[PDB]
Swiss-Prot record, chain B:
Effect caused by changing G77E: In CMT2Y; increased ATPase activity
Compartmental location: Cytoplasm, Cytosol; Endoplasmic reticulum; Nucleus; Cytoplasm, Stress granule
Clinical note on disease: Inclusion body myopathy with early-onset Paget disease with or without frontotemporal dementia 1: An autosomal dominant disease characterized by disabling muscle weakness clinically resembling to limb girdle muscular dystrophy, osteolytic bone lesions consistent with Paget disease, and premature frontotemporal dementia. Clinical features show incomplete penetrance. Frontotemporal dementia and/or amyotrophic lateral sclerosis 6: A neurodegenerative disorder characterized by frontotemporal dementia and/or amyotrophic lateral sclerosis in affected individuals. There is high intrafamilial variation. Frontotemporal dementia (FTD) is characterized by frontal and temporal lobe atrophy associated with neuronal loss, gliosis, and dementia. Patients exhibit progressive changes in social, behavioral, and/or language function.
Positions of post-translational Phosphoserine modification: S17
Name of the protein: Transitional endoplasmic reticulum ATPase
Outcome of mutating F111R: Severely reduced binding to DERL1
Task performed by this protein: Necessary for the fragmentation of Golgi stacks during mitosis and for their reassembly after mitosis. Involved in the formation of the transitional endoplasmic reticulum (tER). The transfer of membranes from the endoplasmic reticulum to the Golgi apparatus occurs via 50-70 nm transition vesicles which derive from part-rough, part-smooth transitional elements of the endoplasmic reticulum (tER). Vesicle budding from the tER is an ATP-dependent process.
Full-protein interval shown: 21 to 269 of 806
Domain notes: The PIM (PUB-interaction motif) motif mediates interaction with the PUB domain of RNF31.
Gene: VCP
Protein family (similarity comment): Belongs to the AAA ATPase family.
Record-listed ATP 1 binding positions: P227, G228, T229, G230, K231, T232, L233
Organism: Homo sapiens (Human)
Length: 726, 249
């Protein structure tokens, strides 16, 4: 970025008396790509926006903006605060504009307010406004404020001379100016920025750059595939990259292509492309491509493969034909025909995936920005407790929570619009009941995320942590050292020993401090792929690994598949595929393959071959610093008080595994919950928060023994450590 | 629960032309005597009858018609509402067609036999399609409104004649016009029926509440279940308690 976010400006008094005119300086408008007659989008406090025309000023300061008292009150700011300016170069003219004056400004005057106030104020003026601007109109020896109600270009527009002005009777008053309907934009798009920036580049370079693609010679984004779960803001993304760029959108959908009969399938599909040809600033988006073009064995018909044929003969031959780009949507990239997915056209494919916790948080922030809540819910625990939900399901979650809030209160008056909005309130219980009544769709899917451990759960093995940093982090940070000597780094590592979940948190910490993606490969999913006789599922997983580069590929226990066999054997139907993936693994892109086993005697010797899975790391029994780190993780995200004896467990529970010391904490927590609720039972029988688990309950939690490790297996692990002791 | 909705008096007679007067309720609201007074039952049903005819009912109760008691609600001993709506325009000789009991006895002139010697200047201002039972001897003969000369609720002029070419069709068509719509009439797994009742009833009667939320969750509802469960009657029961066009395919 730049210093101090240089669109931030200081409000100052103006010289011009115009309401819709703000003033800047000469090198500021040159740096911010601003003209002397162009329009901007001003943003300020209390999430209030403004649309204005920047004019040149000579008395204006370098880092200040001159404006009158109207925009200062419209942005709800006083003298001395900071405001921001955003350029708005894509404004369209308005069609119908509804204006209603405030009640105190029309007391004493009667008649038509259009020909006296509205007609001279907009007589070839072209003043831009937004929804909620209160602008002062002078006339009849008075000063009457007029407020924008609703425009057909609903976010922002310029008053055309053909715009019909609506000034009907019974106006609204000064209120909380609630938002209820709008048009989408880049801020409306949620958490997709790692791919939103890429597709932003691949549509911004087609914008107003004809000679740039002549400098390339060829246009690189000929066809763009956007695949993911159904409903991941797909047409929202397509509509968002159209209006702010400035083009003709003209969406068509595959069901509407099949909606016409035989012979009419060429009608309104080719004609869409001559429509795109006659309007060179345009994009093309098609929805449900699997309904048009499935796989070749799935093409069980004649008219549908005819439609596939006109799509192919229209998609191959638009090479520099009004420089239009083409977008498409599908569930998975292999669901479409692979002959469509070749090169020359339809090559710039991109994944979207599910949102993360912060992406879900900002999606819910967008969906709850327009609706006033009870302002005591944090909205972060709501977006953090959800898991595997599409953004459409978050919108449905917000709608059902509002339905819960409406159904909680009884019936009001029937139909003013000032009773069921200012009484809107949602609780933690409202969204919690809404969380139960919310069917997800992104479940049963390989999630992609950057998790958060922040390196301090890990106890001991600091040289092992340094080796894991040098294998993964430092090729990303300093690849010039590895290109200095040309050494191919060890991209594959093995974990063996007790059944620990600390290797999972190790991989999570690698993805965290690497700031890279994570993929959790499940052992039950591996046996699903084995017993389901579908060994081709590895390929799209590794394709998602390539498209989510850099990433961490945490595989579970691979010896369980060999445990299912034991007549004997070395490799299985899933095992031999990942060796071909490792041979197909490039040394670039910083995609790491990390393995997690328990018993390495029953694994493939081809895994033990060099270049496939390179080095083996033993994870030993937990140590006392790792035991107090385990107790710190037990104290992580849990309300606890003082007088805790963290050194009490490590002196005698050294023979137990780390899950036993974890289960001590959950058992003491359930004991605390049980004693608190029987204290509630005592309170009800008789008709303080007690936030600390008292350590007698901790000692009753550590009393029972469930030692899951075996000492002979520990000697077996030490025997393989001595085998690797060279 | 509304002040208009009040408990109903028992049916003294089976006449559509007689409504008893409740004088404390007449002192409560502002109802004007004369031609037309609007009344509502339940499930979005509209009807009009005259007032100040009998003066038999006591305070906070009004005696109404028999046909607005058996229809326009789910049962007797329930609420009835009133509404002032006077001096509407006039119609001409509606409800010429009987449906059920013409096949026994004689046909007659079909309105000079049982309609003319029974009415007392309340010229049946009912919904076009609603019924009313009247006969001289048996007093259980219904008819159906088929002539639609007036578009709003209008009384007709007395001693008017139109074409008498109407023929009876069926008896069960009155029962099949509802086809037994009722939440008591439906069987009901009451939990799932409660959520579907909520998620259609919040669409019901409050179209502007969708502007308050801004998001509409009902855009389509699947009905999972094994066949034989009344799935084609569950949607029929959800309809016509709301009041809309059902139109199954
Ligand atoms: N990522 C998202 N962010 C915000 N809103 C979303 C998102 N995904 C879906 N929605 C909501 O879901 C509705 C339909 O979007 P979507 O299901 O993506 O359409 P399509 O499936 O045709 O791409 C929209 O009204 C939008 O508000
Ligand atoms: N380097 C390390 N050495 C020892 N223990 C560790 C290390 N890093 C993390 N741990 C701890 O080991 C525990 C994982 O072992 P455990 O809970 O017994 O296995 P599981 O949960 O798979 O049954 C985690 O709670 C973690 O805090
Ligand atoms: N749950 C129910 N409540 C009331 N009537 C029912 C119910 N289930 C079946 N019936 C009766 O059974 C007959 C056939 O209905 P049914 O087989 O349930 O249709 P569908 O299976 O399409 O819902 C209907 O005439 C209906 O009266």
């Amino acid at each position: 970025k730049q210093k101090n976010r240089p669109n931030r400006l200081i409000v100052d008094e103006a010289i011009n008396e115009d309401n819709s005119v703000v003033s800047l300086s000469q090198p500021k408008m040159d740096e911010l790509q601003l003209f002397r007659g162009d329009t901007v989008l001003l943003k300020g406090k209390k999430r209030r926006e403004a649309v204005c025309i920047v004019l040149s000023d000579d008395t204006c300061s370098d880092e200040k903006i001159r404006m009158n008292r109207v925009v200062r009150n419209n942005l709800r700011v006083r003298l001395g605060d900071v405001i921001s300016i955003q350029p708005c170069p894509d404004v369209k003219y308005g069609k119908r504009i509804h204006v209603l004056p405030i009640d105190d400004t029309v007391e004493g005057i009667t008649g038509n307010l259009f020909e006296v106030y509205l007609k001279p104020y907009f007589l070839e003026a072209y003043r831009p406004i937004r929804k909620g601007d209160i602008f002062l109109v002078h006339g009849g020896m008075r000063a009457v404020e007029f407020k924008v109600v609703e425009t057909d270009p609903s976010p922002y527009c310029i008053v055309a001379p053909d715009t019909v002005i609506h000034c009907e009777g019974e106006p609204i008053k000064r209120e909380d100016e609630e938002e209820s309907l709008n048009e989408v934009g880049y801020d409306d798009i949620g958490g997709c920025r790692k791919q939103l920036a890429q597709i932003k580049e691949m549509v911004e370079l087609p914008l107003r750059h004809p000679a740039l693609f002549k400098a390339i010679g060829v246009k690189p984004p000929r066809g763009i595939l956007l695949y993911g779960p159904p409903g991941t803001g797909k047409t929202l993304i397509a509509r968002a990259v159209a209006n702010e760029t400035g083009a003709f959108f003209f969406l068509i959908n595959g069901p509407e292509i099949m909606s016409k009969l035989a012979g009419e399938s060429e009608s309104n599909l080719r004609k869409a492309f001559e429509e795109a040809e006659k309007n060179a600033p345009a994009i093309i988006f098609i929805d449900e491509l699997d309904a048009i073009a499935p796989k070749r064995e799935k093409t069980h018909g004649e008219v549908e493969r005819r439609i596939v044929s006109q799509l192919l003969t229209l998609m191959d031959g638009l090479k520099q034909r009004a420089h239009v780009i083409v977008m498409a949507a599908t569930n998975r990239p292999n669901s479409i025909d692979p002959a469509l997915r070749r090169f020359g056209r339809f090559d710039r494919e991109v994944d979207i995936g599910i949102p993360d916790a912060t992406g879900r948080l900002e999606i819910l922030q967008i969906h709850t920005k327009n609706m006033k809540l009870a302002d005591d819910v944090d909205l972060e625990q709501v977006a953090n407790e959800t898991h595997g939900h599409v953004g459409a399901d978050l919108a449905a979650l917000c709608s059902e929570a509002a339905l819960q809030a409406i159904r909680k209160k009884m019936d009001l008056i029937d139909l003013i619009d000032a009773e069921v909005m200012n009484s809107l309130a949602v609780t933690m219980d409202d969204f919690r009941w809404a969380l139960s009544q919310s069917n997800p769709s992104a479940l049963r899917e390989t999630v992609v995320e950057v998790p958060q451990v922040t390196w301090e759960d890990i106890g001991g093995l600091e040289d092992v942590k340094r080796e894991l940093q040098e294998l993964v982090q430092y090729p990303v940070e300093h690849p010039d050292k590895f290109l200095k000597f040309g050494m191919t780094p060890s991209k594959g590592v093995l974990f063996y020993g007790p059944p620990g979940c600390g290797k999972t948190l190790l991989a999570k910490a690698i993805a965290n401090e690497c700031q890279a993606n994570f993929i959790s490969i499940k052992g039950p999913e591996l046996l699903t792929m084995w017993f389901g006789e579908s060994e081709a599922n590895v390929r799209e997983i590794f394709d998602k690994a390539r498209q989510a580069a850099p990433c961490v590929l945490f595989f579970d226990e691979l010896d369980s598949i060999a445990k299912a066999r034991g007549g004997g054997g070395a490799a299985d139907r899933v095992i031999n595929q990942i060796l071909t993936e490792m041979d197909g693994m490039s040394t670039k892109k910083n995609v790491f393959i990390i393995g997690a086993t328990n018993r390495p005697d029953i694994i493939d010797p081809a895994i033990l071959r060099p270049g496939r899975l390179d080095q083996l790391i033993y994870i030993p029994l937990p140590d006392e610093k790792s035991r107090v780190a385990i107790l710190k993780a037990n104290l992580r995200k849990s309300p606890v008080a003082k007088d805790v004896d963290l050194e009490f467990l490590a002196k005698m529970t050294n023979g137990f595994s780390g899950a036993d010391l974890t289960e001590i904490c959950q058992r003491a927590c359930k004991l605390a919950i049980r004693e608190s609720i029987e204290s509630e039972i005592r309170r009800e029988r008789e008709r303080d928060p007690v936030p600390e688990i008292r350590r007698d309950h901790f000692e009753e939690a550590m009393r029972f023994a469930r030692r899951s490790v075996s000492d002979n297996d520990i000697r077996k692990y030490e025997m393989f450590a001595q085998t690797l002791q060279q």
